[model samples]
Target: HWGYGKHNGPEHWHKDFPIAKGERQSPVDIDTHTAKYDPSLKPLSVSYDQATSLRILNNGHAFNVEFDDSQDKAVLKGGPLDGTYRLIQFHFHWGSLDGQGSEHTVDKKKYAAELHLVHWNTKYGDFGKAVQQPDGLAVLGIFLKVGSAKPGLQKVVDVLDSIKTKGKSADFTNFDPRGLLPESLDYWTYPGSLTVPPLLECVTWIVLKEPISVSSEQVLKFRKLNFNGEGEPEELMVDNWRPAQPLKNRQIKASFK
Candidate 1:
């Protein structure tokens, strides 16, 4: 299986998954200077029902909070999307050190962490079927800075101790992800793929321009999670972010000038 180790890292991903070098790879560096400001881009509309949240899981990669996408209770529209996208799950990427774990960068500068809220196009049906199509997924990227304690994030952080080991999971619900977002919806968008292996090129990336704050203690707590499960040698689960990919010929559009 693919991993973030030196031997199985991104550099070697192409050997098993040739699409790793695909043109529309994700986590590309966002250069505001070159990005075109599209006045036509509509304001993003997000409606998330806290009751849609189901649970959280540590799948040996990152902690993911899954949602009930059966209904339109949590959905995203506008801002470059043609149809409604149902919220599926949300996760994060961070490093062992400060100012380094984010997958996508801004002007080549990395953030303390990054949040990925994944959604799939409802028109294409379920996530499995949609993922194989071009307009399958839409991921919202929110940069995290280390500063004041985020009250919204405390609920998520409080449960980390119960799921420190890989493959661990816990019941989590009644949490609205919208509360974690910035006040402004301004963003930079582009076509890209999944940051991990099998790197499917089906995501419409929306990276917010403004960053949210998380306490230094909160970040340190995230580093305590283990990559291995019970009975295995404990491995520190940190630096779980893919390196920025080549922009290729894709044009990143900005919602605001």
Candidate 2:
């Protein structure tokens, strides 16, 4: 099993589990050449009602927010994707190593962190059943950097104190996850599989071109989430992100339309 004091190190993670080799890794570098150059793309406003229903939870790995059948306003449609896809769960990838933390690499370079917005088809009723379907998920990715302060991030930091311990979570009432999105929704779209296990290939991925900034202090505060129980020191949860993997023959599409 992957845990502290076991074969938890990245070097020995896949020894017993072979499919771990097929995971689509993150921390991809962002550069102009890999960017979507279309000037016609428009950003759609995510309504406040829809955004507010988003429930935030700190799920050990990263702070997450979910929207599904239970939430009245989670609607997703169009493209190679069909049916109404409800928001399931969303999380983040951060640097375990000093300078690298994102999953989607560009030209073999790494970024600081990557935030995932995951959604699933409502046809399956729940995430547990839907994840088994091939065309069951959508994931939007946004990269994060540790540098100057970013306005959009303050809302997230405002609640950090409540989720400081492992398994520690609080209901983030009236907060909209969409507010966490960068001002520009210009994104890269593609059909890929889940970055984590039970790696279903039915995800429509939208990787945003714009990134949000977080101060070094904010980054350090996030480092406090641990995999171990609340009794353990925070060090056990340090560096919970996955490494980057080769893009293989997969094509990454941009919403530069």
Candidate 3:
């Protein structure tokens, strides 16, 4: 099993998941200056029908708010995507300390945390099939900076107590994940893989240039979670982020000049 520890951390994952050393690995450090500005790339369009609200859970790797995919109409379109992709789940990556945590970086700088909104293409028929295809997924990445608290984020953290241990989940619905997004959808996009194990290189990463804020106090709540299951040895769930992988000559694109 992999974890963010000295034994089974990111450095050790390649031993099991060979794709860890693949050509298009993710959580890359974005060089804003060199990122190409494209006049053709349109702003991202994120539409979600809150009725799909399922539940929030601690899936050992990170906290996730999953949705009921079928007929939800929660789709992500535009912004380099050729087809509509259904929203599957949303999660966050945080650090053991405030100085680092964000998966994607800007000019070698790391944010307090990072958010991933995962979507799957319906053409693939299912999330499982989609994950194995190059055009299967599109992840909307958002950086989380420590500042004033966000009402939407607050509600998310407030419910963490209910799913604090691995494999735990609580019934949750009607929560708008968009409330946590920055006002502008301007972003940097590139070809990349999932930052976690099984390390699938199937994602089209769209990372936002602007970030939303989370209070210092609220940040601490994210760490309170335990990577280990209840009654097992307690391992705090923090620094659940992968360091920036090599860009592999892939060009990063920006929608705005």
Query: What do the candidate models score in CA lDDT, each in turn?
Result: 0.91, 0.62, 0.92
What TM-score would each prediction reach against the true structure?
Answer: 0.98, 0.79, 0.98
Q: What is the lDDT of residue 140 in candidate 1?
A: 93
In order of lDDT, best first, we have 3, 1, 2
Q: Output the lDDT of residue 14, model 3.
A: 98
Using lDDT as the measure, the top candidate is 3
lDDT of 1 by residue, 1-257 (tens): 77788988788899999999999998999998999999999999887754389999989989999999898888888999999999999999999898799999999999999999999999998999888988999999999999998889988998998998989999998887977898899999999999987799999999999999999999998999888896699888899999999999899999999
lDDT of 3 by residue, 24-84 (tens): 9998999989999999999899897453768999999899998889864789999999998
Which of 1 and 3 is the better model by lDDT? 3
For candidate 3, list the clashing residue pairs, or say none: none
Question: Global lDDT for candidate 2?
Answer: 0.62
Question: Per-residue lDDT tens digits of candidate 2, residues 156-211?
Answer: 77676777665667666565666567778677765566665434556767677787
**2 or 3, greater by lDDT:** 3
